[PDB]
Amino acid sequence: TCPFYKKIPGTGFTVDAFQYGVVEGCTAYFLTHFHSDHYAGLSKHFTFPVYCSEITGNLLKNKLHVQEQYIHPLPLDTECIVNGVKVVLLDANHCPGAVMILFYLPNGTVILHTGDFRADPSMERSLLADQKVHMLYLDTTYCSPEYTFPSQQEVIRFAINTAFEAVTLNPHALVVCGTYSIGKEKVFLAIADVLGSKVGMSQEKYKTLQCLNIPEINSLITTDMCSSLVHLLPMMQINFKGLQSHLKKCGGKYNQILAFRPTGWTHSNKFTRIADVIPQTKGNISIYGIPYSEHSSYLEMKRFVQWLKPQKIIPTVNVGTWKSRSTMEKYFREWKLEAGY
Ligand code: NI
């Protein structure tokens, strides 16, 4: 049944709760972003109101065929009224169109649901600075101190320099980047930009990117693989077998592949720096795993919470085991005692 951490008390609202059938007493279903574990269950047959960002609404209409009359897009950074309750959508610094949601309950309680987010100091100057938040429904994906990772800027710098150097040394090398969802577009777009190429991809993925309101996107992507030297493939295909195969398909236009797999975290982060990453190589194929995260590190998450000083925290990730839940609750108590709220 719908878990309690997907329900907003004092309202008939749910968040990211589309796979439970009809949730008894739900008058409005919010969707934070277009990732499959969150939208799971939506289709052209859904007939309740869905509240979301403009970008998420484009994706619901064009990729899932949800009917327009049930899509309610809201602008960001704007006080809006939904079924008599004041709400605001904030940028979550996750994937395109991802939001956090502030609910102002009739009784005076203020609730923030982060959806999926990568905490950033910029959030400390949004409409969040303007009032107190009593309850926080928190993306705890990486809530343990082993999870450190570099800035997104540092990671894109590494990828751009690596690709530029490789292709300048060998003009017959192909760059391949893996994907399985929206998010992390900067990786492939930054590389294509430094190389003066467009990124080539399947028709389904091209359609997905045309939903995202990215400025000048017609200048950066294409469905013509042959005119492109940065290809996007399914993440499943980013291995030596899948890449040797793909190389055959280009008909000797290329003799070398350099591939990037933008992972979340991998345990080489506990030891190694970004400057010291190395690929796995077989023959003329090299695969780089790069730690490009669209979720908070442990320290980024801790700073956000110690800034916000909520009265109660409700985790939304890693809630399935007692040992995970207990460990997270220990970190929350440390944070509160260190900061004095
Ligand atoms: Ni997500």
Q: Decide: 31 and 51 in contact? Cβ < 8 Å.
A: yes
Q: How far apart are CA 124 and CA 130, in angstroms?
A: 10
Resolution (A): 1.6
Q: How many residues does the chain have?
A: 341
User: What CATH number does the domain containing 153 carry?
Assistant: 3.40.50.12650
Q: How far apart are CA 92 and CA 32, in angstroms?
A: 9
Q: Residue 208 sits in which domain range? A: 148-295
Taking the centre of ligand 1 as the mean of its atom positions, its distance from the CA of residue 166, in whole angstroms, is 32
Taking the centre of ligand 1 as the mean of its atom positions, its distance from the CA of residue 141, in whole angstroms, is 10
Q: Are residues 174 and 234 in the same domain?
A: yes
Q: Are residues 31 and 117 in the same domain?
A: yes
Q: Are residues 177 and 302 in the same domain?
A: no
Phi, psi (5° rounding) for residue 89?
A: -95, 130
Q: Are residues 275 and 326 in the same domain?
A: no
Q: Are residues 289 and 167 in the same domain?
A: yes
Contacts 24+ apart (CB under 8 A), 321-324: none
Which amino acid is it at 141?
T
Taking the centre of ligand 1 as the mean of its atom positions, its distance from the CA of residue 139, in whole angstroms, is 10
Q: Taking Cα atoms as reference points, which of 182, 279, 159, 178 lies closest to residue 237?
A: 178
Taking the centre of ligand 1 as the mean of its atom positions, its distance from the CA of residue 169, in whole angstroms, is 37
Taking the centre of ligand 1 as the mean of its atom positions, its distance from the CA of residue 140, in whole angstroms, is 12
* Sheet architecture: strand order including 7-8: 7-8, 13-15, 28-30, 50-53, 71-74
Taking the centre of ligand 1 as the mean of its atom positions, its distance from the CA of residue 94, in whole angstroms, is 7
Taking the centre of ligand 1 as the mean of its atom positions, its distance from the CA of residue 32, in whole angstroms, is 9
Q: Are residues 239 and 164 in the same domain?
A: yes
Taking the centre of ligand 1 as the mean of its atom positions, its distance from the CA of residue 176, in whole angstroms, is 23
Domains identified in the chain, total number: 2
Q: Are residues 87 and 131 in the same domain?
A: yes
Q: Decide: 108 and 135 in contact? Cβ < 8 Å.
A: no
Q: Taking Cα atoms as reference points, which of 214, 209, 167, 171 lies closest to residue 191?
A: 167
Taking the centre of ligand 1 as the mean of its atom positions, its distance from the CA of residue 296, in whole angstroms, is 12
Q: How far apart are CA 244 and CA 233, in angstroms?
A: 13
Burial (Cβ within 10 Å: 0-12, 13-18, ≥19) of residue 121: exposed
Angle at 184 between CA 89 and CA 190, to 5 degrees: 120
Q: Are residues 182 and 205 in the same domain?
A: yes
3-state secondary structure of 194: helix
Q: What do you get for the CA distance between the two ends of the chain, in Å?
A: 34
Q: How far apart are CA 175 and CA 286, in angstroms?
A: 10
Which amino acid is it at 54?
E
Q: Decide: 32 and 99 in contact? Cβ < 8 Å.
A: yes
Taking the centre of ligand 1 as the mean of its atom positions, its distance from the CA of residue 298, in whole angstroms, is 17
Q: Taking Cα atoms as reference points, which of 54, 14, 13 lies closest to residue 33?
A: 54
Taking the centre of ligand 1 as the mean of its atom positions, its distance from the CA of residue 99, in whole angstroms, is 10
Q: Are residues 38 and 11 in the same domain?
A: yes
Q: Are residues 142 and 157 in the same domain?
A: no
User: What CATH number does the domain containing 71 carry?
Assistant: 3.60.15.10
Q: How far is CA 102 from the centre of its chain?
A: 19
Q: How far apart are CA 316 and CA 33, in angstroms?
A: 14
Q: Decide: 90 and 123 in contact? Cβ < 8 Å.
A: yes
Q: Decide: 39 and 71 in contact? Cβ < 8 Å.
A: no
Q: Are residues 8 and 129 in the same domain?
A: yes
Q: Decide: 221 and 198 in contact? Cβ < 8 Å.
A: yes
Q: How far is CA 76 from the centre of its chain?
A: 17
Q: Are residues 197 and 277 in the same domain?
A: yes
Q: Decide: 158 and 134 in contact? Cβ < 8 Å.
A: no
Sequential DSSP letters for 40-57 = TT--TT--S-EEEEHHHH
Q: How far apart are CA 76 and CA 122, in angstroms?
A: 15
Q: How was this structure determined?
A: X-ray
